[PDB]
Write an enzyme that holds these catalytic residues in place. Sequence first.
Site, PDB file in Angstrom:
ATOM      1  N   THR B   1       0.820  -1.203   0.000  1.00  0.00           N
ATOM      2  CA  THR B   1       0.000   0.000   0.000  1.00  0.00           C
ATOM      3  C   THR B   1       0.853   1.251   0.000  1.00  0.00           C
ATOM      4  O   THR B   1       1.594   1.503   0.945  1.00  0.00           O
ATOM      5  CB  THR B   1      -0.938   0.052   1.215  1.00  0.00           C
ATOM      6  N   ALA B  49      -9.748  -1.410   4.148  1.00  0.00           N
ATOM      7  CA  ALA B  49     -10.584  -1.197   2.978  1.00  0.00           C
ATOM      8  C   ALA B  49     -11.965  -0.694   3.374  1.00  0.00           C
ATOM      9  O   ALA B  49     -12.441   0.316   2.839  1.00  0.00           O
ATOM     10  CB  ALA B  49     -10.695  -2.495   2.178  1.00  0.00           C
TER      11      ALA B  49
END
Lengths: 213, 201, 220, 204, 199, 199, 191, 191, 215, 215
Positions: B1, B49
């Site tokens: 990420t 998420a």
Amino acid sequence: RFSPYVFNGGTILAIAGEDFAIVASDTRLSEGFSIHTRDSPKCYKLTDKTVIGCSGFHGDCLTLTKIIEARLKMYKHSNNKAMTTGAIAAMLSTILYSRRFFPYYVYNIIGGLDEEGKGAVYSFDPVGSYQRDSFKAGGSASAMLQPLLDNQVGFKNMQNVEHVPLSLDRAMRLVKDVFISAAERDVYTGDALRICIVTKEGIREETVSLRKD
Amino acid sequence: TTTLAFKFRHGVIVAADSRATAGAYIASQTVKKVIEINPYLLGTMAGGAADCSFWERLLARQCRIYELRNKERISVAAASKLLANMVYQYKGMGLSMGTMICGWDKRGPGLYYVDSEGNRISGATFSVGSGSVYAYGVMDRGYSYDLEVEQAYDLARRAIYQATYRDAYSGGAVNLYHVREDGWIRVSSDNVADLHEKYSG
Amino acid sequence: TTIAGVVYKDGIVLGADTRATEGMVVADKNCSKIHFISPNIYCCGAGTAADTDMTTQLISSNLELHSLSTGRLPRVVTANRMLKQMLFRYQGYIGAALVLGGVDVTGPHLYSIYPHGSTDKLPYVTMGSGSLAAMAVFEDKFRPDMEEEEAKNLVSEAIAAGIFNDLGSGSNIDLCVISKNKLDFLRPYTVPNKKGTRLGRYRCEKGTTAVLTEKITPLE
Amino acid sequence: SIMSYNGGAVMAMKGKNCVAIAADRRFGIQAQMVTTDFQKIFPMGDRLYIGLAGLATDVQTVAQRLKFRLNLYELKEGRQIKPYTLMSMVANLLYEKRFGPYYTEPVIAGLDPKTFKPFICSLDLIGCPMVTDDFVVSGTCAEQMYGMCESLWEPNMDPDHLFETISQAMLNAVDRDAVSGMGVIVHIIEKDKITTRTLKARMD
Amino acid sequence: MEYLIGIQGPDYVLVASDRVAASNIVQMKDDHDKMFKMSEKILLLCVGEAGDTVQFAEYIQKNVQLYKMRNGYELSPTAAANFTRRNLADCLRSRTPYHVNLLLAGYDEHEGPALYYMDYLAALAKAPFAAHGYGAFLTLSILDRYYTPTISRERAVELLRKCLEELQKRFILNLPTFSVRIIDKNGIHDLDNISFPKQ
Amino acid sequence: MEYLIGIQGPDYVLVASDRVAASNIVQMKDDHDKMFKMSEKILLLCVGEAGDTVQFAEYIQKNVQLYKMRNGYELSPTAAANFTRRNLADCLRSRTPYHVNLLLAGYDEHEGPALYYMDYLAALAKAPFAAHGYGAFLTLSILDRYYTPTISRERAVELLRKCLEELQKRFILNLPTFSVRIIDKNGIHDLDNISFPKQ
Amino acid sequence: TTIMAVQFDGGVVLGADSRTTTGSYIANRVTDKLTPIHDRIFCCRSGSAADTQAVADAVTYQLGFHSIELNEPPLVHTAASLFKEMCYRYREDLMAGIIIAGWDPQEGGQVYSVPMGGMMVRQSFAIGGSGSSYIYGYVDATYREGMTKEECLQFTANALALAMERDGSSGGVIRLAAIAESGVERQVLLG
Amino acid sequence: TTIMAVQFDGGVVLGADSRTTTGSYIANRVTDKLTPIHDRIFCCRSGSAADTQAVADAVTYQLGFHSIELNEPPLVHTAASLFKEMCYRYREDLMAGIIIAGWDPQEGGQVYSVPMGGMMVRQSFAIGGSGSSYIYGYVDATYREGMTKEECLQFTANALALAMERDGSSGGVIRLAAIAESGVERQVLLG
Amino acid sequence: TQNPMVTGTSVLGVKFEGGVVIAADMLGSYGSLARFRNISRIMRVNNSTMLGASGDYADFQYLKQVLGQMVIDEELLGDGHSYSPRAIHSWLTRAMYSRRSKMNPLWNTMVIGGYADGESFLGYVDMLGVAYEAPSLATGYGAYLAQPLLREVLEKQPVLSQTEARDLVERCMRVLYYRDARSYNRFQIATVTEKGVEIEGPLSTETNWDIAHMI
Amino acid sequence: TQNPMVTGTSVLGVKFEGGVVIAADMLGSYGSLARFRNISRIMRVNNSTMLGASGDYADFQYLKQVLGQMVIDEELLGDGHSYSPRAIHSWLTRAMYSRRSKMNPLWNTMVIGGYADGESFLGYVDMLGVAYEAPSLATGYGAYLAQPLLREVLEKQPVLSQTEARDLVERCMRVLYYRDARSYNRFQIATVTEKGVEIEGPLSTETNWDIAHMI
């Protein structure tokens, strides 16, 4: 002490085609080092174009299935029309976040047709995100199945291999091969296979046996 | 990420990767991380998420309510403020959220940085994620205010390529969005291996 | 893992199932769990595999040494005493679930060993994770002084029920029969589970993978 | 885990008359990589290699210790070593640290010194051997390589399709893996010659 | 905590440590030296628990000097690196472990320059450039952006200048002065001490 | 973590915070502002858990502006200080505590200048000079060596110059730029931005 | 589990259940819980199994070696002292509920008890095992001083019967042992 | 501690020790462990003391109010149901060994038992208390179906005698209670 | 309930041709002490369905009370409509799940057997809400011990008679008496058909111990 | 010993004119179960000193063995020299301290009573090595219960006779029978004088319960 979760296992597959959505799942429900049954299908037929699969902890699967059915009937009995696929996905995401701080220990895969009449597979996570992907394998045997679908569906990591659109019976032989090959090495997979196919003409089901151990 | 954002003379650049793992196991390769809030806002996905997706959807709902009540488009600072106030009410209960907010303002460019720890701050450059430090390094090499457009494109693309080259938790397709005065515009979606062939020599 | 033992009218029939799991994934489909001790005494292991392996090879070495020093056939009780003394000397740290069986001059003698050092002489034992199903079949249909094919059918039935219960094996249940004179040992006894035939052909081609750097090294 | 400290994946696959072993190239601490040229497959005599996965400390330490004992054996006896002998040697070396265990999963792949018979086996972290006929794997990622090799293996394989099968298996199972990647090295050996190829893997 | 950089060239190795010996609030010493001249063409750097650094310098430095006085010639960088790795790997599994993070810089007549890379778990590495710390993160992004295998030494000095000027820009710690060495076919030549006025 | 000095004068208050907004490795923002103009003669500074600082700023700043619109005039610094202390003391013994470290700087027409000093346990103090963080420790001795109650403002600026020059000498963090305010009989006058090139 | 020893005028009478369990599963249904050491001296065990087995083997070693070197039949108090020393030395590691009984030529029938601690005492009757508390409830009610052999057999029969009936861990089958000047008499009863 | 209730043909017979202890010190030497609720219904308690006192008082409250509102003599099974409800709804903080007994005009003498969990059962005899396991050892040995009053008194006398003799916490003094159609007959024995 | 005080033990139930037979024993052990050796562990629900359970007996008394009140209410509706066994199964599953969602679980292990409208039914309800249908159920240690006998004979013979089912249950309960430490030689057989619901008396087992005469 | 298995209870001792009386009971309770209700807890050492103890009975057997062998050894020296009770006190104190220094303590509470050369002696030894002299000792709960009676009478009368001491010991053992949970109505009195060492038989108590007739 009393632990609120237990790992029941299971394996759910989905494949998004040009005009079809195939959802298949084993019907083994186990616990620890025992077998409770050899018939418990993870698939559920919601509408004429929507099939949901739910793996993980089984009681949350049953509760979530019944709540989704209730809200389906609420939308139908309120607005004179059925939901779409993405609306059901959004609603399920709202539900999975609506119990954020006491989560469902459930993997979820929704396959079905969109409003254009094409295949769409909406994956999930235990906490409530989703995305529109072409293929997913959820549960314990996820890692035993994702790279082979990367090899065959996606045609990934290959050279001079053209892209053919995925037909129906080719997808059927794919599903049979991947469930046999995954049932060879997994402990939470076997004893049956319930294959659900969503076309523009209804829902088909299919029972294919496996190895009995 | 690994995500980044930086504003300059010609608007705001937003780029991100598309890999979202689960522990040591990669879930997907095509996770669209830059969540399209509005035709004038872009939100990202920075740690978690569901939390980023849900709270940015709730913020988009709130912004649409604000616009439909005032007939006037929301500012950037107001959106970041609403997001920080809504996130602060579950502090300590285990929310991970480090998103970024980009958009165009009455003042012009606007760039804020909102954490689940609530560190709502303005600024000019930001980068979130595990391999964000790599992006900080090569970006603060290549950063200016008076850059061109394709120069900024090359800066962001090279930055995300270096970040995914060093970090293990980052990869997949490199999205690239560009915020203008009128509205944001997706530039391109570039794969890592294409950048390796192109930029390896 | 489901091992069993029994005493028929002359000797001992042992069985096993050969799925060597590593965690949650089947790591092996063929693992010899019936180990050598002597021409008349054998042994089975359960639990930690390498502990059972190293211990049974050490004790088989010690009994080969003692038997070649003596000059006659070994006794089962000496193996039992060495095993219980060793496992008590390790204070139950080593997990080695053993089934010991052999035929001496005195006749058939069956011992089961729990990894702390508790031993029992029994007419029939089951050990392992799925031992309960084989013990169910034993407690249902055992009678003293069975015949040969009767005992073979019983042990095969017991381990087969262990395979139809959880964590058995895909394998074709291994058997071994020890008598006063005749030793037999049968790996592919009965195959219930055939692998499904391939439906196509996921065969690669000569060049479907990009190659960066080759090397050739000749030999003799 | 401690096995997931530096990553790692080693695959060995038995073919018809030949054997193929492959591994990854990445070296690094838990999430930060360092280099792409870390060696994990070592030559132990002719037509026989060994692969090591897990903590890199135990990889190089056990590799040098095994080379020590291997050269002592091959100098005490003029002949070269049989693979079962090497397997038992690695088992004894690992079982000497029963309670002080190394964190490694050695994989041995080699040919017969007299005939052209291939050989594969793998061991556990305390010295549990396992001989098979199709393939053995080790490292952090397991289920990926199990699914790929149980999908792609054939019994009778020419060395070219062997190379392509192990290539596709390693590429897809590594690209799905996170902590182990950054290139693949492949050793495909036989009676006549020794081939070492490196693949264009995704550098992501 | 801090980092000492080790850039390798075609026929040189560019090492550069800091001069900081701080303890948890204050910077006690601003002219510290972490550079341990093993031989005429072999350097050694060390970062870790700072009581272990000096004892490593004693053990490694003096035993290599003992080898040098024994046989007749200078060690290779490779054997020295393996000897350090071996002593880490032996001293680790005891009641007295060592927690240091090393890297080694040597020069052979035949192999030319060589750079190695330890860790507190005794791992060898043959790196074009390696790192440790938090400066690991920052210096490796800039260095892996701007690297050439056929790079000249003044380009490496300029690259190090640029990398330090971006070290003094987004770091939380102080790091005021860096000392810089170089290794060539001659030996260890000390370059000038590299500090910056920031603003 | 960081730092804010609070020097009281005869007829002025000399406050100076930093502009650092780092997060645990990197310095994300180097032009941060912790200065919250409450009224025309009352300043406030804040350091603590950085999600609580802003929410405290919202509550206190806007409620003081609310008081100003309510009655017709500005609060005393003392009552404002007590109101902040009161809100800390109420917010502490709950399920939602605040962990911030304040000090207040005001100026009355009658009482003249006034300096207060909070803590994360809601303690009032009427101090000659205060600080927070770890530079607090080093800097109050330096300030307490060279302090005069009847000190002029240029002496205070020079003293703060000296204090920063000894802050960039034995402190572990960076702190490159400090912003500086002053309060007088007029109001809040912003002085020039105070940075140093170190080496 | 439940072990019992009662002496009388001529000799002693022992008794035990078998039913060695582990947790809630019975590992073994019938067990020689009482162990011969010499031809006239027994011991019956409880608690953990491997501890008592290893202790009984080493005591058998030392006692056989000592009594052969004396060239005389051994004492019972001797074996009790040996069990006392070996129990007491590793109380940190052993769990022994060893009860010593046996006829002696010099001193007749004797019963010694060694509980989990390592103390040694002479008693006229003894209990032992986790399911012994109950017949320890009424062994001071039904017992009469100066029984015969058959009264001791019927007594311990009713005792071990009720102990096997009530405790969940106890059960299995009744084993008896009668030691006197005449002989050693073992039998297997049910009822 | 050790409490017991035995029925016979005409009515029931109760019994308890006293010896309320705290740790190893006796706080109180003589205690009414059995408690009147109604004039014909008793309960005897164990576990913690304050819990059982408050529960017995609230049951006395509700049962007295209900039986006055019926204008009929109450049932015993009703009071057993009341103890079941109050123990089961709020278990988790309580330790109750409540044993209900008492004569009824419709159903004669009855004995109900409520252990620490909250289940309810009717028995012909009952034990209770931490030192009750032993006489629970032989209460299935000495009992004979269809005793008289004097046989029940002698029976429980031997029971509480051995329970007080063996258990360390039990002891003190013997309290008895005889409930029939005629009256309630309580007595105190010592030595 | 966090800690079950007084537990039962394994419950066995199996369908046959036009009926379901269920048998469980009658023991109320607390810890290891078999304190309550005469209790009833099968409720004969009104006329079609039938319940047997494990775990904490007090919770079973509670659910007996609640279910009795619900059945009484529907029978007092007078509409001629009753509960199907599957409806009872659904209600019980929802009840257990709503108990454990509030972190206050009912420590039980329940088996619902019923025969209504030509079709047999045999349902399972766990403490955690895991609930399914099966042609043969086995709880506690019965799923480890007497389950493979059920799955052996049902694979060996897909249909059954009433006598074969009762004999197989008798053999399985004999085996559970052989090697369960929490078991007791007294059990009752309960049977449903279309003729009603019948509770048989406290039967016992016939045991063998001829392996004890070996050494 | 980390965990004491079989504990005794309180030991009482008090000097008088030319002698020391010690009395302890005869109970071997394990937990709360009075498992060994006939044991001896006082060793009569050779002719002058005398030992009584509490705590683990096995350790008392051990120290009985060791002390018996040492006294036997000095008596076999044949020199006419014996152990003074203070020497026994010193040796036992050093033994316990060196025991507990190795972090493996002997769980005991020991009382040494002796009369040698005109002077009485009554010493105390704790598990931790705490050791002193006293005109009256009381162990376990006796230091909480029967200690103030001893200290009352010694304050009320500094010297004693043997009869007054014996009566006081009987009263204190009666009190310990009244309100110690680990107590038993069977005790033995042991007495040393210049005439030798004497162990009396298993005496008992005379109790009162006339408060039970109150409400």
